[PDB]
Amino acid sequence: QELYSTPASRLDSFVAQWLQPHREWKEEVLDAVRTVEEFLRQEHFQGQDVRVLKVVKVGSFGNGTVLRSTREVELVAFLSCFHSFQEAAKHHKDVLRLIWKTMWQSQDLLDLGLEDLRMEQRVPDALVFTIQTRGTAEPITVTIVPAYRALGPSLPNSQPPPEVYVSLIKACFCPSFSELQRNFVKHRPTKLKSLLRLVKHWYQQYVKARSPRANLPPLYALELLTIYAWEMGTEEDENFMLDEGFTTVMDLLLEYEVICIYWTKYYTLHNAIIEDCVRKQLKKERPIILDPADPTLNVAEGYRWDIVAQRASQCLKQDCCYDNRENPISSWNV
């Protein structure tokens, strides 16, 4: 069975039965990742004496959208030796090499079958490796990106002080705000997570897999578009029709040339400098999907939305976007 041959009326069952990972498998993976997290927090890295002050899971394991097919766990490490955005940028690779050097001597990680260490140019660079789980000894890929801790402790989803974004804009994808990128997707209703899984699965299997060399947009852009569709289309209803949501996202993808989306979730227009930044962003070539966590980033800029629209057009012709009386599923209003 696959998505395109799944009737719209059966999408809830498809997501639940085909796309959800087994809960014990997820726990197996997180148990192994915990050892990496503990290593990072506890190790006195010998650069000065360097510490990872905080480690956060991001991407699918961080925001609750892990799929059956997910085989990577993404971590962001906040470093003691970065005191500005500029310092993090300058010493990003230095820190990854330091962490890598030290991992090869870690009895704990060696006992988890650590292998395949390399740096990958993931914009920004990531240290990438595999470890083996404790039960099955199955391999899982783990990635680490270093960050300047620009934000202090607070409730999930409070607003950063405007001065943080003023400094960002003065300083000239920003892992300093990765907790916010996480939270924006994580702190949503269960059924929205099902729609996110569905869209991500579709994107990976029918778009990314088919054009693996193309400059396709990041999954985050698709997450933001999906959230937008739901927020506007249902007035943030925890109860909604999954099939209508999926069709709505496909329709929106067709219209990429006129998409202009932003939020004042983590920044508002009250600060003149932030307002000026956002105003400037919104006048640029569309699609614009402004990062709710970072007013300087149009997450959609520069990517092959033309390819995505081509696949969305095909998707809309499939059983997953038709009812059982051969009527197209109707999309939400905005």
Residue numbers in the entry: 5 to 51, 57 to 181, 187 to 348
Question: Mind quoting what the paper says about this structure?
Answer:
We expressed the OLD (42 kDa) in E. coli and purified it to ∼95% homogeneity by immobilized metal affinity chromatography, affinity chromatography and size exclusion chromatography. Crystallization conditions for the OLD were established using standard commercial screens and the optimized crystals diffracted to 1.6 Å. However, no density was observed for the four most N-terminal residues or for the two most C-terminal residues and the C-terminal 6xHis-tag. Likewise, two loop regions spanning the residues 52–56 and 182–186 did not display well-defined electron density. The N-terminal lobe harbors the five-stranded β-sheet found in all polymerases. The C-terminal lobe is a four-helix bundle with a three-stranded mixed β-sheet with an additional interstrand α-helix connection. The crystal structure of the OLD exhibits a high similarity with active OAS1 and both proteins form the αN4 helix, which is absent in inactive OAS1. Notably, only after the binding of dsRNA does OAS1 form a rigid αN4 helix, which participates in coordinating the triphosphate of the donor ATP in 2-5A synthesis, however, in OASL the αN4 is intrinsically present. OASL intrinsically forms the αN4 helix due to residues Val67, Phe70 and Asn72 that anchor the loop and form the αN4 helix.
The 2′-5′ oligoadenylate synthetases (OASs) are a family of IFN- and virus-induced antiviral restriction factors that provide protection against a wide spectrum of RNA and DNA viruses. OASL, on the other hand, is devoid of enzymatic activity in part due to an incomplete catalytic triad in which the third carboxyl acid in position 152 has been substituted by a threonine. Recently it was discovered that the UbLD of OASL could substitute for K63-linked pUb and interact with the CARDs of RIG-I. OASL thereby enhances RIG-I signaling leading to an amplified antiviral response.
